[PDB]
Design brief:
This is Translationally-controlled tumor protein homolog. By secondary structure, the chain is α+β, with helices and mostly antiparallel strands. It contains three helices and ten strands. It has a single domain, classed as Metal Binding Protein, Guanine Nucleotide Exchange Factor, Chain A (Beta Complex). A hairpin with an 8-residue loop joins strand 8 and strand 9. Helix 2 packs antiparallel against helix 3.
């Protein structure tokens, strides 16, 4: 089973146990991002309850939700993109051009719709590493999680 890890913290944030789809249903963004549909999970683990309802992705990869102002996010994302580009030049130079080119419209899409998102840090809680984005599509009852693929690397157990 293949797992996806943040290139900076090495936290696991997704895996092939989840089917990947086009981010926001936009095929043109698949080149640098993908999304997965989450589902409810019972007792994944305050004073407790008998039936603890959680989101499978969050529980599985031990993600922690985090809130932040739109301005703080714009600052964070500008630096995170530079950090990824620096990383790509050093380890995956063939991705440098697409990322630089395609990142802008994806980020502009997120910013334009900033209030529709929840954000998640991985296990290391590193505010400088990648964030996983979550949103509810139409009238769906569980969220979809979007990942910026160049900020991740693949690993096999």
């Amino acid at each position: 089973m293949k797992v996806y890890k943040d290139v900076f913290t090495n936290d696991e944030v997704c895996s092939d146990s989840y089917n990947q789809e086009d981010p926001f249903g936009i095929a043109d963004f698949r080149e640098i991002a993908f999304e997965v549909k989450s589902n409810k999970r019972i007792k994944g683990n305050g004073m407790g309850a008998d039936v603890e309802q959680v989101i499978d992705i969050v529980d599985s990869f031990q993600l922690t939700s985090t809130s932040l102002s739109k301005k703080e996010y714009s600052v964070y994302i500008k630096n995170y993109m530079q950090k990824i580009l620096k990383y790509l030049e050093e380890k995956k130079p063939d991705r440098v051009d697409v990322f630089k080119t395609k990142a802008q419209p994806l980020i502009k899409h997120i910013l334009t719709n900033f209030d529709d998102f929840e954000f998640y840090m991985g296990e290391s809680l590193d505010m400088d590493a990648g964030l996983t984005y979550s949103y509810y599509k139409g009238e769906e009852v569980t969220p979809r999680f979007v990942y910026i693929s160049d900020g991740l690397y693949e690993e096999k157990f």
